[PDB]
Amino acid sequence: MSAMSIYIIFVSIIAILFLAIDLIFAPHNPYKSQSRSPFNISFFIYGLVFLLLDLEILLLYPFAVSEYVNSAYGLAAALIFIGIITIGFVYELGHDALKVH
Amino acid sequence: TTPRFWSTPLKYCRWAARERPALFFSVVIGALGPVTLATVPPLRRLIGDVDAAPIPLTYPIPPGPRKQLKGYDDDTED
Amino acid sequence: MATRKPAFNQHVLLDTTPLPDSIPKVKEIGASSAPLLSASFFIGARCKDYNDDYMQCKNENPGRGEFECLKEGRRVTRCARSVLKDINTHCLEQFRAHWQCLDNNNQQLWQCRPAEWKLNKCVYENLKLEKVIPDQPKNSTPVHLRQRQIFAHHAIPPWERPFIPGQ
Amino acid sequence: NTPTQTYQFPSKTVKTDYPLIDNDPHFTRVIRYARPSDYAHGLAAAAAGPAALWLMERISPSQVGRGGFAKAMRLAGFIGLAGGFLYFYQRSILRFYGMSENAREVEMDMREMTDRVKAGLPLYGESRLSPAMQGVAARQSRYSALFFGVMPWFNFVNHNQHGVDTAKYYQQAERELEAERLAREQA
Amino acid sequence: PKDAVHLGLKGAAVVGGIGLLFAAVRTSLARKNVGPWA
Amino acid sequence: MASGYGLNGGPSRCFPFWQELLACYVTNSSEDNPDGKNKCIPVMEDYYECLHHRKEAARVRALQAAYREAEAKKLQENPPTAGQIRNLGLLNKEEDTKKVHCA
Amino acid sequence: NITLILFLIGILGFVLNRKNIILMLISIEIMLLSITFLILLSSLNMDDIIGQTYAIYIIVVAGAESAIGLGILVAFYRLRGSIAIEY
Amino acid sequence: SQISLLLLKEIYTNGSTHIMLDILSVLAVISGICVIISKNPIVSVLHLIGLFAYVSFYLILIGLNFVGLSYLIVYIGAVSILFLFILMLINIRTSELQSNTSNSIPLTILVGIIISSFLFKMLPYGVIISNQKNDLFFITSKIWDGALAENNHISSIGNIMYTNYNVWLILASFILLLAMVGAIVITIKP
Numbered sequence: 001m002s003a004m005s006i007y008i009i010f011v012s013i014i015a016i017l018f019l020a021i022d023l024i025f026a027p028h029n030p031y032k033s034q035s036r037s038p039f040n041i042s043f044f045i046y047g048l049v050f051l052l053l054d055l056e057i058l059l060l061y062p063f064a065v066s067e068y069v070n071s072a073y074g075l076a077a078a079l080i081f082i083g084i085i086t087i088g089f090v091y092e093l094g095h096d097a098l099k100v101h
Numbered sequence: 102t103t104p105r106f107w108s109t110p111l112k113y114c115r116w117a118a119r120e121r122p123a124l125f126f127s128v129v130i131g132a133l134g135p136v137t138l139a140t141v142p143p144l145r146r147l148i149g150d151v152d153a154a155p156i157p158l159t160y161p162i163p164p165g166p167r168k169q170l171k172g173y174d175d176d177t178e179d
Numbered sequence: 180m181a182t183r184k185p186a187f188n189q190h191v192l193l194d195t196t197p198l199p200d201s202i203p204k205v206k207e208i209g210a211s212s213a214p215l216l217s218a219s220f221f222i223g224a225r226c227k228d229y230n231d232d233y234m235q236c237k238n239e240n241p242g243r244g245e246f247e248c249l250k251e252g253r254r255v256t257r258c259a260r261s262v263l264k265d266i267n268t269h270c271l272e273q274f275r276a277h278w279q280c281l282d283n284n285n286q287q288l289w290q291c292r293p294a295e296w297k298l299n300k301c302v303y304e305n306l307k308l309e310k311v312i313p314d315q316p317k318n319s320t321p322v323h324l325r326q327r328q329i330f331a332h333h334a335i336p337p338w339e340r341p342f343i344p345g346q
Numbered sequence: 347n348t349p350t351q352t353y354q355f356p357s358k359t360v361k362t363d364y365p366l367i368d369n370d371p372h373f374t375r376v377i378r379y380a381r382p383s384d385y386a387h388g389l390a391a392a393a394a395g396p397a398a399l400w401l402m403e404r405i406s407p408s409q410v411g412r413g414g415f416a417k418a419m420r421l422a423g424f425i426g427l428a429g430g431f432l433y434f435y436q437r438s439i440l441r442f443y444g445m446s447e448n449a450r451e452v453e454m455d456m457r458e459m460t461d462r463v464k465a466g467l468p469l470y471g472e473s474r475l476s477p478a479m480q481g482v483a484a485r486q487s488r489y490s491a492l493f494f495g496v497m498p499w500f501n502f503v504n505h506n507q508h509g510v511d512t513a514k515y516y517q518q519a520e521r522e523l524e525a526e527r528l529a530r531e532q533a
Numbered sequence: 534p535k536d537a538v539h540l541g542l543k544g545a546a547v548v549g550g551i552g553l554l555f556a557a558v559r560t561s562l563a564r565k566n567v568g569p570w571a
Numbered sequence: 572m573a574s575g576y577g578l579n580g581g582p583s584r585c586f587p588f589w590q591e592l593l594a595c596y597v598t599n600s601s602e603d604n605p606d607g608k609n610k611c612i613p614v615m616e617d618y619y620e621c622l623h624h625r626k627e628a629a630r631v632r633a634l635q636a637a638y639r640e641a642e643a644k645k646l647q648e649n650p651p652t653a654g655q656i657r658n659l660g661l662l663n664k665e666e667d668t669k670k671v672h673c674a
Numbered sequence: 675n676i677t678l679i680l681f682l683i684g685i686l687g688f689v690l691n692r693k694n695i696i697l698m699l700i701s702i703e704i705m706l707l708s709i710t711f712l713i714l715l716s717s718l719n720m721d722d723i724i725g726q727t728y729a730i731y732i733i734v735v736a737g738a739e740s741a742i743g744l745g746i747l748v749a750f751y752r753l754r755g756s757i758a759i760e761y
Numbered sequence: 762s763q764i765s766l767l768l769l770k771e772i773y774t775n776g777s778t779h780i781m782l783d784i785l786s787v788l789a790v791i792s793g794i795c796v797i798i799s800k801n802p803i804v805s806v807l808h809l810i811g812l813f814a815y816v817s818f819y820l821i822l823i824g825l826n827f828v829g830l831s832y833l834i835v836y837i838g839a840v841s842i843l844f845l846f847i848l849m850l851i852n853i854r855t856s857e858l859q860s861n862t863s864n865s866i867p868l869t870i871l872v873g874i875i876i877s878s879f880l881f882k883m884l885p886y887g888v889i890i891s892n893q894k895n896d897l898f899f900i901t902s903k904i905w906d907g908a909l910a911e912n913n914h915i916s917s918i919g920n921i922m923y924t925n926y927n928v929w930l931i932l933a934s935f936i937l938l939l940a941m942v943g944a945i946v947i948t949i950k951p
Contacts, residue, residue, distance in 0.1 A: 002777075036755070039850040041948050044748055047846045048741055048944050051839040052937055055737050058831055059730075059922075059930065066919025069158075073479050073503070074923040077930065079134070081923075084934040086131075088941040093124075097945050107420070154314040155476055158580075158910050160234055167235045170228050173257035175203040175250070180902030182584065183721065186824045188776040192900060193659070193767040195672055234906075242587065482924045497931070554875075557868035561689065564761065569866035572722030576921050580912025584721040622720055623886040632895050638766075645762070653769045673763035675892040676786045678880055680812075682873055683793040689872055692860035696802040696848065700809055704793060707836075711816055712888070714825060719887030723917045727926060729828055730918070733835055734933050738940040740840050744847050745944035751851055758857035 045097050056085045205253040210263055213282035217274065217298065218266055224308040226258035262308075269305035273298035289328040293339035300342040309344050347466075348516040355481075357509035358489070366444040367455045369509030370488040372470070373500045379451050380438040387437060392430025396422040432494050439491045456518060463519035469512055471504035480505035572622070585621040592618045677715065680708035693759045699743055706736045777822055779891075785822070789815040798862070800855050803848050810841050827915040 063070060063078045070078070092098070103120075106113040117125035145151075198204070208215070215222070223230070233251040237244030266274050277294040284290035302308050315321045324341045327334075357369060368375070399422040402408075403415060410418075441448035459469055473480055484507035490499040560571040573589040575582050592614045599607035620626050651671045658667035687701030710732045717725020751757060792815065795808040813836045820829030881889075890897070912920065922930060 036852040038752075041748070043846055043850065044744070044843075044948060045945065047839075047843040048745065049941070051737060051741055051843050052941050054839045055734050055835060056934075056937060058835060059734065059933070062915050062919030062922050064919075065913070065916045066922075068155075069920050070923055071475060071479060073475060073483055074919075077923040077927040080927075081930055081934050084931070084938060088938045091942055092945065095945060095949075095951075097949050107416070149318065151316065151318060152474065153316050160906050160909065162234055162238060163231050167232055167239075168228055170232055170254070173229065173254040173261070175205075175253065177257055178203070178205060178253075180900040182904045182907055183899075183901050184579070184824060185776055185899075185901045186822070187779040187782075188901070189771055189778070190768055191771050192898075193656070193769075195763060195765045195767065479924065486924075486927075554868075554871055557871050561865040561868040562692075563861075563864045566861040567864060568861075569863045571864065572717065572720040572724060574722050574724035576723045576917065576925075577721045578718070578723055578726075578914055578917060579907070580910070580917045580920060581907050583723075624890075625886045628886065628890070628897055632897055635897075636895055642764075647764065650764060651767065656767055656769050657772075671767070675881075675884065675889055676789065677888070678877065678884065679790055680793055680816075681880070682877060683790065683797065685872065685876060686869055687797040689869055690797055690860075690862050690865045694802065694858040694860075696858075697797060697805060699844075700796060700805060703809065703840075704796065704812070707813065707816060711819075714820060714828060715823075715888055716885065718823060718825065719885075723914070723921065724926075726825070726828055726914060727918055727922060727929070730831065731929055731933055733831060735936055737835055737840050738936050740843065741940045741944050744843055745948050748847065749947045755852060756857070757851060757853065760857075761860065 042099050049092055049097075053085075053089070056081075202249060203253060205256045206260070208256060208260060208263070213278040213286060214274070215259075215263070216286055216288075217278040217281055217295070218263060220310040220312075221266065221302055221306070221308045222259045222262050224311065225262050225306075226255065229254045229258045262306075265306050266302065270298060270301040273301045284332075287330075288323070290331055290333070292323070292328060292331070292335060292341070295323070296339065296342045299344075303342070303344050348513065352513040352516070353511040355484075355507045357507070360443075360489070362444040364441070364444040364446065364448045365452055366510055367448060367451055368442045370484055370490075370501050370505070370507065371439060371442040372504065373502050376435055376438045376442065379441065379454060380434065381450070384434050384437045388430045388434025390430075391433045392426040395426025395429065398422075432498060435500075436491050436494055443489065443491075456515070459512075459515045460518040460522070463515050464523060468504075468506070469515060470506050470508065473504040475503060475505075481507065484508075573618075585618065588614070588618040588621045677708050677712035680711065681705055684708055693761045695747075695757055695759065699740070699747075703736065703740065706732065710736075781822060782819065785815045785819045789819070800859055802853060802858065803845065806841060806844050806848060809844075810837055813837050813841065825914065827913070827918070 059081070060078065063074065066074065104113045104116050114125070210218070229251070233248060233255045236248040236251045240247040273294070277291055277298045280291035280294045281288070288295065299310055310323065312321060312323065324343065326337075326341065360366075371379075396419055399418060408415065408418075437446075440446035441451045462469055475483065480503060483501070483503040484505045487499050487501040487503075488507075488509065490497075490501075493499070560567070560569075563571060572583055572585060575586045575589075577583040592611060595611040595614045596608055599610045601607060655667040655671055658664040659671050660668060681704075684701045684704030687697055687704065691697050691701075710729050713725050713732070714729050717723070717728075747757065789812055792808045792811040796805050796812065799805040799808060813832055817829045817832040817837070820826075820832065
C-alpha cells in the first residue's frame with residue numbers, strides 16, 4: 001500500500017470526520033418564480049481566453065523538459081509557435097474584449 | 102496629444118514607455134530574445150567561449166570494422 | 180519478457196533450466212551497483228575494446244544479437260571480472276571507501292571526490308588504469324578533477340586534492 | 347579523399363527537365379546563385395501589391411476615413427514584400443531543384459563544390475546540430491519551396507543530405523589535383 | 534435447386550429487421566408519451 | 572507502432588518489423604513486376620504479430636494448457652516454498668539454492 | 675472495450691434526446707474522449723509516443739472546438755432566451 | 762522431476778492492483794449514463810466532470826501520467842469550467858429539456874446491438890486482451906542499452922513534438938488562433 005494511496009485515504013477521512021461531527025453532535029432543526037436577467041459577456045470571455053491560453057501553455061511544457069535535445073532547431077519551432085499565439089493575444093488586447101474601460 | 106507611431110516613431114516610443122509601460126517593455130523584452138540570438142553566439146566564438154559537445158544519450162558504437170581481438174576466451178575461464 | 184515497463188505486476192516467474200552444455204559456461208559478475216559504478220571507469224579502461232566488440236557483433240546481427248554473440252558476450256564478462264579481482268587485490272580499502280560513499284550518496288559521483296581521488300591514485304599506481312571522460316570542454320578543468328563541486332551536499336575539504344595522473 | 351559512400355540517405359527522385367543540383371540548398375546559396383533577373387522579377391512582384399491597391403482606390407474609391415488608406419497601404423506593402431521575396435527565392439531555388447533551366451548554376455555548384463574538396467572542407471559545411479537533428483532538418487526543408495503558396499520554409503542548417511550522389515565532385519577535384527601537380531613537375 | 538421457403542424466411546428477416554429499425558425511429562420521434570411498447 | 576519513437580525516448584519496439592516490411596516492398600515490388608509484393612506477405616504478418624500478438628497468445632495458451640495438464644499428473648512430495656525460493660542464488664544460502672534446484 | 679462502451683454512451687446521447695441541445699455538445703465531448711481513450715491505450719500496447727502525441731492534439735482541438743461551440747451558443751441565446759427546442 | 766517453472770509473489774517493487782482498473786471502468790460508465798439521463802444540464806456537466814476524472818485516473822494508473830494530468834488541467838480545469846460558466850448563467854427550465862425517454866427505448870436497444878457488434882470486431886487484440894481458467898499472463902524483463910538515459914513520456918513527446926512533427930504544432934496554433942478570434946467576434950460588441 002503506497003504512501004500516495006494512503007495519503008488520499010487519510011485526507012478524505014479528515015473530511016468525513018468533520019462532516020460526521022457536525023452531522024451528529026451539532027443541533028439540527030429544519031427551519032427552511034424567479035426573474036431572468038441578461039448576463040455579462042465578460043465572463044464567457046474570461047473563460048474563453050483562459051482556456052485557449054491554458055492550452056497553449058500545456059503545449060510548451062514538453063519543450064521545457066526537452067531543451068537539451070531540441071537545441072537550436074526545436075527552439076525555432078517553439079518560437080514560431082509562441083509568435084503565432086502572441087498575435088492572437090494582441091488581438092485580444094487590442095479589441096478590448098476584457099473590457100479595459 | 103497621444104502620438105501616432107508612423108508619424109513620429111521616436112516620440113511614440115517615448116510616450117509608450119511612460120504611458121503604457123507594461124505593454125511597451127513587454128515588446129522590448131520579447132525583442133531581446135532574437136537580438137541575443139544574433140549577437141551573443143557570434144561574440145562567444147570571438148572570445149573563445151566554445152560550446153560543449155553533446156553528452157551521449159545512446160551507446161557510442163564505434164565506426165569501421167571490428168578490431169579482431171584475442172583475449173579472455175573460454176580457455177581463460179577458470 | 181518484454182522491455183515494457185510493468186505497472187500491475189504481482190508475481191515473478193523464474194526458470195530453473197540451465198544453459199545447454201553446448202554453450203561454454205562463464206561465471207557471472209558478483210558485484211552490486213555501487214562497487215561496479217566505482218569500478219566503471221577502470222572497466223572502461225581495460226575492457227573498452229571487448230565492450231565495443233560485443234556491441235559491434237550485435238549490430239552486425241540485427242534481431243539475432245543475443246544468440247549470435249554469446250562468445251563475445253563471455254569475453255566482456257571475463258575482462259570486467261579481471262578488473263574487479265585486480266582492484267580487490269591491490270586497492271580494496273580505497274575501493275570500499277568509494278562505493279560505500281557512493282551507496283550513501285544516491286550513487287552520485289560528485290558527492291565522493293575525496294574517496295574517488297584516493298582510489299584513482301591507488302588504481303593508477305597498481306594497475307596503471309586512468310579515468311578518462313571523452314569530449315570534456317577544453318577551456319575548463321575536467322569536472323571530476325575540480326577542487327570544488329557546486330552540487331555536492333558536503334563542501335569538500337581544501338586539503339583533499341584531485342589526483343592528476345603523472346603529477 | 348572520397349568517403350566511399352557518396353549517397354548515404356534514401357532521397358526522393360523527381361522527374362524534372364534539368365539536372366538536380368541540391369534538393370535542400372542552404373539559404374545563402376539560394377541568394378548567391380540568384381540571377382539579376384530574379385531581383386528584377388522579385389521587386390516588380392513586390393510593387394504589384396500596393397500598386398494594385400492604389401489602382402483600386404483611384405478607380406473605385408473606398409470612401410475610407412482620413413487615415414485609413416495609409417494603414418491599408420502599409421499592410422499591402424508588407425504583403426507585397428513578403429510575396430515578392432518568396433517569388434524571388436522560388437525563382438532561384440527552382441534551378442537548384444532542376445525544375446527550371448539551370449546551366450549557369452550547374453557550372454557554379456561544380457566550381458564551388460570541387461574547390462571545397464581540394465581545400466579539405468566538408469561539401470556543405472559544419473553543423474552545430476546533432477546528426478539526427480540534421481536528418482530532421484533535411485527532411486523538413488527538402489523541396490519545401492514548392493509549398494511556398496501555403497507555408498514558407500528555409501534551410502538554415504548545414505546538413506549533408508541534399509539528394510545528389512557526391513562522387514562527381516570528388517572525381518573533378520582529383521582530376522585537377524593531378525593537373526596542378528603535372529604543371530608543378532614541368533617547371 | 535434451392536429451398537424457396539427457407540430462403541424467403543431469410544429475406545423477410547433482413548428487410549423486416551430494417552423495417553423494425555425504421556419502426557424504432559418513428560417511436561423515438563413520437564411527440565406524445567406513448568411508451569416503449571409503441 | 573510504426574513511428575520509430577517509443578515511450579522511454581528510444582525507438583518503438585515494432586519499428587524493425589515496419590522497416591523490414593517497407594524494405595521488402597520497395598525492393599521486390601515494381602511496375603515491371605507487380606507480383607513481387609507477394610514476397611512481403613510473411614513480413615507483413617510479422618509486423619501485425621508484433622503489434623497485436625494474436626499468434627503468440629494462441630501458442631502460449633495452447634502450451635500452458637498442456638503444461639498445467641502434465642503438472643497435475645506428477646506428484647510434488649516437497650515443492651519449494653516461497654521463502655526458499657526467495658533465497659535462490661544468495662551469498663550464504665547454499666542449502667536453499669540446492670533444495671530449489673533439486674541438486 | 676471500456677472505450678467502446680463510452681462511445682456508445684455518447685452515441686446514445688443523440689438517440690435519447692429530442693429537446694436538450696446542451697446535451698448534444700456533451701455527447702460530442704464524450705465521443706471525443708472515448709476515441710482519445712482508445713488511441714491512448716493502443717499506443718501503450720504498441721509502445722508508440724506518436725499515439726500519445728495524437729491524443730494531445732485531439733485534446734487541444736476538442737478544447738478549441740468547445741470554445742467555438744459555446745461561443746456560437748451564446749450568440750444564439752442572446753437573440754432567443756432559450757436553449758430549448760419546442761418539440 | 763523438479764519444477765523448472767517457479768511462480769511467487771513480489772514483495773517490494775510490487776506494482777498496483779489491476780482490480781482498481783475495474784472500479785474505475787464501472788465508475789466511468791455509471792457517470793456516463795448519468796450524464797445523458799440527468800434532468801438538469803448543470804448536473805449533467807457535473808457527471809461529465811466525474812467521467813473525465815475517472816478516465817484521467819485510469820490513465821495515471823497505467824503509467825500515462827502526463828496525458829492523464831493534462832486531462833485534469835485542461836478538460837476539468839478549463840473546458841468544463843467554461844461549460845459550467847455558461848450553463849449556470851443562462852435561463853433554464855428543466856421541464857423544457859425533458860423528453861419521454863421511454864419512446865426511445867427500442868431504438869436505444871437496437872442502436873446498441875448494431876453499433877457494438879460492428880465496432881467490437883474492429884478492436885485489435887491488444888485492447889481486448891483482458892476483457893471477457895486458461896488466463897494469459899504478460900511477462901516483462903529488463904534491458905540495459907535501452908535504459909541508458911530513459912525519458913519520461915513528457916520528454917519523449919517533447920523530443921519529437923517541435924522538430925519531427927512540428928507541422929502538427931503549426932496547424933494546432935492556427936486552430937487556436939481561429940478559435941480565439943472567432944469566439945470574440947461573434948460574442949462582443951465592437
